[PDB]
Amino acid sequence: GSHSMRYFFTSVSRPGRGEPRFIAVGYVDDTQFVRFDSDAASQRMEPRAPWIEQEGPEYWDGETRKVKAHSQTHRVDLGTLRGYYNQSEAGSHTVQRMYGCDVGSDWRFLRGYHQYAYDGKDYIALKEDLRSWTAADMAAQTTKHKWEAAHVAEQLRAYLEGTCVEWLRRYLENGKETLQRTDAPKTHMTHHAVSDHEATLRCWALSFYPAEITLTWQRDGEDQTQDTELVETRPAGDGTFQKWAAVVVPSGQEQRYTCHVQHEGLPKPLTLRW
Amino acid sequence: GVAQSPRYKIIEKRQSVAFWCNPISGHATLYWYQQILGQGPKLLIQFQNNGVVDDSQLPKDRFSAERLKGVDSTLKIQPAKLEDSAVYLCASSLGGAGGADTQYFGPGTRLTVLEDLKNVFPPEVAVFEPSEAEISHTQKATLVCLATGFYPDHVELSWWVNGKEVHSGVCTDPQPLKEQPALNDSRYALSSRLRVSATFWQNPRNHFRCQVQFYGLSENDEWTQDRAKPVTQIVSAEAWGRA
Amino acid sequence: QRVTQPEKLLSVFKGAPVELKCNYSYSGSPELFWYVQYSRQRLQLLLRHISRESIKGFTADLNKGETSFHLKKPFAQEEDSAMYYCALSGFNNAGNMLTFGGGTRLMVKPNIQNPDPAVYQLRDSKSSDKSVCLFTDFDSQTNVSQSKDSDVYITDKCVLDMRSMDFKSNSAVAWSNKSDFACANAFNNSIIPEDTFFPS
Amino acid sequence: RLQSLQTYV
Amino acid sequence: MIQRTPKIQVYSRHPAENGKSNFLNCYVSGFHPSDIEVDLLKNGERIEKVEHSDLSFSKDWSFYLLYYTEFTPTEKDEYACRVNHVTLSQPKIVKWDRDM
């Protein structure tokens, strides 16, 4: 399948109560492997998955120095961004940055991305050609002009097409037993009477990885997104994921309904009936 | 462009000094560099907005810098050592990527730290008229200007013809030589040439002047001795064409 | 972030090729620059690696095996005479700080089409019998040396440009206040034997 | 691996 | 300045079995800004020694977080998640149901 690496930076000002708080995490696919919290005691980049810990001490010295360096620049950014919008020094504000690279089933570069956000709003993003910027407002135009003069995109394109994918493949090979597996969803179905003439059918998908999954309900074989309810896929907290989908049906008619589970760990999609 | 003040400075060692730098309007990164003779610029301190980014290669024992409002910046040496004699360059970038960007430089501040002021001398200036032989041979006339006996090496020489500065026909030594090469405190001398057509030199209404701006002491430097205090001053010498 | 410019001085003739070395030693992620400073002018950028650009006829190519970023140009011009500085922005240092190399002075000697080497004597315009000697109108191949007498002062050869006439010429000056110093015995380095010594 | 280059808005 | 309301889900790591050690999760997602208060409740009282995942976010910039603690479900023991946020007029309680 496809694979990906993403880093997430969040920094939150707290005026009158110290420096902003900076947190960084890195993911491969749907699996966290590093974290950094500028309030935690160790002041170090830390491993969050078993395969990254065989990198050696130089990786961690390396990544810690860099993550500390970028923690300072989002600190400055909060100052700068408050000036661009002429907001007061009193209010707490947040800054986010995401970037990463995608890789295909043959492990070659697919796409790259690098975007910035201010108080939960899109501020500037690297377009798909990795050569020009999408800036939203007028304050972002300044940032766009600064980054254009600085050739930031050329530098970012070199990372995303080189360092990034190469290290993704490295992680993908060192984490082979966790990152390249497919756990088929364990499935069951539950039935709860609601009235004396209505009943809820819940279709369950447990213990599946990766997180992409499709749960669909049909009535007599025709898709039925009418009286349904479909919860967000959630982490199980041991690396696997969980999902369910429910439909309320008139009692005496449960056998007309089918749930269809589509997942990559399933050679053929799964039909379940009560 | 980047502004810097002052342009030249003489102080005694163990004294203090302050340099000032105004960045290009709206530049978030500001740099102070030290450039010793025969070397490249060496970074002293880098500012982003009003915060310090890189303090490392800055002698904190004597060097100090400030950019309180993220605009202009002041660098201070208290106290100065002889080894501090250098060109101090400030520079600025738009700031989207700090030093990974074009850096725009000011003109610099040439600082000269001395064991004492009593060695400082303005130049004497003398123009030498073109030889008849060269006229006859080439139908061109080369004037020579000597600025001699100035210390330290703080001079800008220009040529002025009929009350305008001229650049065509001019050649100024990029460096000055030592008038006695043995000494540490050796005085300097410098030459420059202005070459004009023989007809221009033969016209007795044409007026040539050689002008040497010396950068010495300020009005505040203590002066004790019988000769005049060698302050910043312009010394000129002129010649008229002659048939 | 060591940046090494091995040569301090590079002297070439107009129209000859130019290669200013630059090597660098940096364990991290670098960005490479060349900066230039023309005389009585400000230090300024010449080119940047990632711009993939050519400036004022100049190209430089990053070789990561050889860790080099040599500045190359096939046909040198006189406007190219200046100081050149290699620079490294080091991304693993705070603020991607910049480290300059030591500098290399580039001197492009002019092509004197019509040499006419002569040494003249000039007299002072104020107080009498102060006087200096001018070696002038020699080819760029003539190198000027100093004098065995350390009370005779001799300046390097210097090029002036009479632009209205489109005439270039070299010159060098010697003087002494030792009252028995002659222009005939002033420039005893290797001058042309066709040298015109004006009679007296 | 984190990208090295330090950018500012 | 944007605001998003957190979505809440309370559930166990593994299928519940009365008297069998398990993990109780409270997954808080889709909210903005990041400061949030989340407690796991046993019979209405705050459970101490709760861990939570590192702060991250989704394509649309809203943050998500996993809170979790070791527990053993019994049939009488009620369990819940209590969340406060600037987007709620008062704390929100979501009770753990074995089948949701």
Q: What is the DSSP string of B151-202?
A: BSS-EEEEEEETTEEE-TTEEE-SSPEESSTT-SS--EEEEEEEEEEHHHHT
B187-206 residues labelled b (16+ CB within 10 A) or e (exposed)? bbbbbbbbbbbbeebbeeeb
Structure tokens at E45: 């009282």
User: Nearest CB to C43: which of B105, B193, B238?
Assistant: B105
Give the residue from chain B lying closest to D8, CA to CA: B96
Answer yes or no: are the C-beta atoms of C112 and C170 closer than 8 Å: yes
User: Do both C44 and C87 map to the same domain?
Assistant: yes
Phi, psi values for residue A267, rounded to 5°: -55, -40
Q: What SS3 state is found at A39?
A: coil
Vertex B55: Cα angle to B54 and B56 (nearest 5)? 95
Task: Categorise residue C183: left if φ over 0, alpha if ψ from -120 to 50, beta otherwise.
Answer: alpha
Give the residue from chain D lying closest to C91, CA to CA: D5
Are D1 and A152 an interchain contact pair (Cβ–Cβ within 8 Å)?
no
- To which H or E segment does residue B134 belong? helix B132-138
Q: Where in the sequence is the domain holding C26, given as residue range(s)?
A: 1-110
Q: For residue A50, is the peptide bond before it cis, meaning its omega torsion is within 30 degrees of 0?
A: no
Q: Which resolution, in Å, applies to this structure? A: 2.3
Q: Which residues of A touch B101 (CB under 8 A)?
A: 149-150
Phi, psi values for residue A179, rounded to 5°: -85, -20
Answer yes or no: are the C-beta atoms of B100 and A150 closer than 8 Å: yes
Are A116 and D6 an interchain contact pair (Cβ–Cβ within 8 Å)?
no
Are E13 and A8 an interchain contact pair (Cβ–Cβ within 8 Å)?
no
Q: Which residues of A touch B47 (CB under 8 A)?
A: none
Give the residue from chain D lying closest to C92, CA to CA: D4
User: Do both C115 and C100 map to the same domain?
Assistant: no
User: Do both C4 and C83 map to the same domain?
Assistant: yes
Q: What SS3 state is found at C140?
A: coil
Q: Looking at C67, C94, C110, which one is the last position of a domain? A: C110
User: Do both C9 and C89 map to the same domain?
Assistant: yes
Structure tokens at A20: 């902003």
User: Nearest CB to A149: which of B49, B53, B96?
Assistant: B96
Are D3 and A164 an interchain contact pair (Cβ–Cβ within 8 Å)?
yes
Please count the residue pairs, one from chain A and one from chain E, whose beta carbons lie less than 8 angstroms apart.
Answer: 72
User: Nearest CB to B48: which of A76, A147, A155?
Assistant: A76
Helices (H), chain A: 57-84, 138-149, 152-158, 165-174, 176-179
User: Do both C2 and C82 map to the same domain?
Assistant: yes
C22/chain D closest Cα distance in angstroms:
22
- Identify which of B186, B122, B118, B119 has the alpha carbon closest to the alpha carbon of residue B154: B122
User: Do both C99 and C134 map to the same domain?
Assistant: no
Method: X-ray
Answer yes or no: are the C-beta atoms of D5 and A156 closer than 8 Å: yes
Query: How far apart are the C-alpha atoms of E37 and E71, rounded to whole Å?
Result: 20
Residues 6+ apart with CB under 8 A from C116: B137, B138, C137, C196
Q: Which residues of C touch B182 (CB under 8 A)?
A: 150
Q: Where are the beta strands (DSSP E) in E32-91?
A: 37-42, 45-46, 51-52, 56-57, 63-71, 79-84
CA atoms within 13 A on the CB side of B195: 27
Look-up: residue for tokens 């369990």? E79
Answer yes or no: are the C-beta atoms of E7 and E30 closer than 8 Å: yes
Across the beta sheet with E79-84, what order do the strands follow? Answer: E45-46, E37-42, E79-84, E92-95
Are A66 and D2 an interchain contact pair (Cβ–Cβ within 8 Å)?
yes
CB distance from B102 to chain A under 8 Å? yes
Query: How far apart are the C-alpha atoms of B12 and B27, rounded to whole Å?
Result: 34
User: Do both C1 and C47 map to the same domain?
Assistant: yes
Question: How many structural domains is chain C composed of?
Answer: 2
- Identify which of C66, C27, C33, C65 has the alpha carbon closest to the alpha carbon of residue C47: C33
Query: How far apart are the C-alpha atoms of A84 and A113, rounded to whole Å?
Result: 25
Helix axes A138-149, A57-84, angle to 10 degrees: 130
Query: How far apart are the C-alpha atoms of C88 and C78, rounded to whole Å?
Result: 27
Answer yes or no: are the C-beta atoms of C93 and C39 closer than 8 Å: no
